[PDB]
């Protein structure tokens, strides 16, 4: 059977795109987002001339900062910039282009070395970014060594334990699919074929009784991967229809606010995936997006990990973000937090002067010990909620 997720109401799709639209005018390097560009080009929606300026800003920022600036794009972000080039039917080229390719290849080589031949060692970033990097290079027809593919081939088998991420498995699966379709790494062809099936099975086993693969926010990338190949023996069609039901309910309940999440979902709603960047169709018609023309809440903020420990009740207007609660806590006094830019949005580097170290992140949780599925800007707490910030080791 095939994974077919049928078209959602054009109105519903349009309002998703309108969430992306304001970002088209935010061209500062801290806000530039190659995933937004890609998601829009693969969608049934367009922003017209704004897109061209956006791509121009991407090429200015990424090439100047990496090869020559407020900040620098990470290597993972460079990979998504490569996807953005494919979305405009471009191959990375010229002397600058060649250098960018080798920088991404160095990223993969360093992660390979960090992982080790024992395979005990962890990557400095994630297996998600490792897969994303292989995919990005493959989309531009740039080859990577079998030894590099093998790390990912291992990371995908159920009991491996490098990660337990439906997103990472889907991205891998996407990387493996590009290798297979391009006939790259022929000395790993059978293992690559088997790994794709492995990822299929593990994703179909992460399905929630509601219908989602892992989490509402894992479902988009999971669907992208599942759409790329048949799955004989399995009931892929049924699983995917159940996922649309779950997806539809989530959409109608305002689950998708975050621009990156929308950018990963929009291709699915247009029957496209990142694998369509092998043979892009840049001139396919797309609908022009036009701009879419009081209660008081108390949220408890608790940071047990820090000594002295922090528990406080913060009063904010309803619909306020966790970041909004954090900002009020700084004004009232006794709270300091630090944030770093991400394509997803603000990321919490520090709470109360403690900044997470290697393999440490500040988890956002709502009692009792339930990890939040959304970021500090995206999540809006219900009244009487306790929001906790815990330093945890990944």
């Amino acid at each position, epitope marked *: 059977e095939m994974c077919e997720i049928p078209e959602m109401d054009s109105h519903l799709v349009e309002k998703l795109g309108q969430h992306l639209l304001p970002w088209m005018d935010r061209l500062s390097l801290e806000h530039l987002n190659p995933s937004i560009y890609v998601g829009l080009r693969l969608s049934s929606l367009q922003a017209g001339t704004k897109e061209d300026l956006y791509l121009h800003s991407l090429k200015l920022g990424y090439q100047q900062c990496l090869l020559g600036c407020q900040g620098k794009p990470s290597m993972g972000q460079l990979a998504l910039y490569l996807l953005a080039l494919r979305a405009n039917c471009e191959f990375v080229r010229g002397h600058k282009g060649d250098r960018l390719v080798s920088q991404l290849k160095w990223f993969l080589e360093d992660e390979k070395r960090a992982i080790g031949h024992d395979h005990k060692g962890h990557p400095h970033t994630s297996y998600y970014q490792y897969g994303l990097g292989i995919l990005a290079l493959c989309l531009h027809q740039k080859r990577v060594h079998d030894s590099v593919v093998d790390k990912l081939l291992y990371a995908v088998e159920p009991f491996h*334990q490098g990660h*337990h991420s439906v997103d990472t*498995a889907a991205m891998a699966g996407l990387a493996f699919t590009c290798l297979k379709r391009s006939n790259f790494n022929p000395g790993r062809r059978q293992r690559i074929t088997m790994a794709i099936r492995t990822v299929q099975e593990e994703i179909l086993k*992460a*399905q929630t*009784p509601e219908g989602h693969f892992g989490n509402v926010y894992s479902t988009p990338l999971a669907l992208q991967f599942l759409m790329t190949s048949p799955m004989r023996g399995a009931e892929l069609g049924t699983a995917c229809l159940k996922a649309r039901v779950a997806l539809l309910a989530s959409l109608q309940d305002g689950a998708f606010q975050n621009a990156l999440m929308i950018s990963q979902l929009l291709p699915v709603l247009n029957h496209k995936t990142y694998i369509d960047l092998i043979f892009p169709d840049c001139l396919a018609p797309r609908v022009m997006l036009e701009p879419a023309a009081q209660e008081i809440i108390s949220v408890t903020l608790q940071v047990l990990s820090l000594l002295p420990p922090y528990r406080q009740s913060i009063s904010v207007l309803a619909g306020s973000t966790v970041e909004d609660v954090l900002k009020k806590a700084h004004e009232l006094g006794g709270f300091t937090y630090e944030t770093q830019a991400s394509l997803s949005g603000p990321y919490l580097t520090s709470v109360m002067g403690k900044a997470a170290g290697e393999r440490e992140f500040w988890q956002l949780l709502r009692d009792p010990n339930t990890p939040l599925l959304q970021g500090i800007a995206d999540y809006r707490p219900k009244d009487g909620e306790t929001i906790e910030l815990r330093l945890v080791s990944w």
Partner: nanobody
Amino acid sequence: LQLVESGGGLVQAGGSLRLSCTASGRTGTMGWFRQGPGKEREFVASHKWVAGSTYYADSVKGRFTISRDNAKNTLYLQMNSLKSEDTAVYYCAASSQIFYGATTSIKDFNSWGKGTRVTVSS
């Protein structure tokens, strides 16, 4: 979430101990872990929500049979063909998150039972 184990006492090798764990509420992944006395804890088997979302540690494969009643929030381990090493305390465990296969390690499970000890006789 509360997990309450049942069954499991004093069997001769070769075996047939059934085991049970019931939970107050619906959970994502439910699994079983055995602790040898004095030796940390070991993963035994998972079972997520759908169909054969069954994961087994290589020690128990072929005895095995983790099963799950989603209606009644209750998992089970058939544990046929028992041996010396199977003597241990068996703990039920649960987590509200369904992940990408094989959680295996502790720490990935938030809710634990008190355990049923199982003992096999030579």
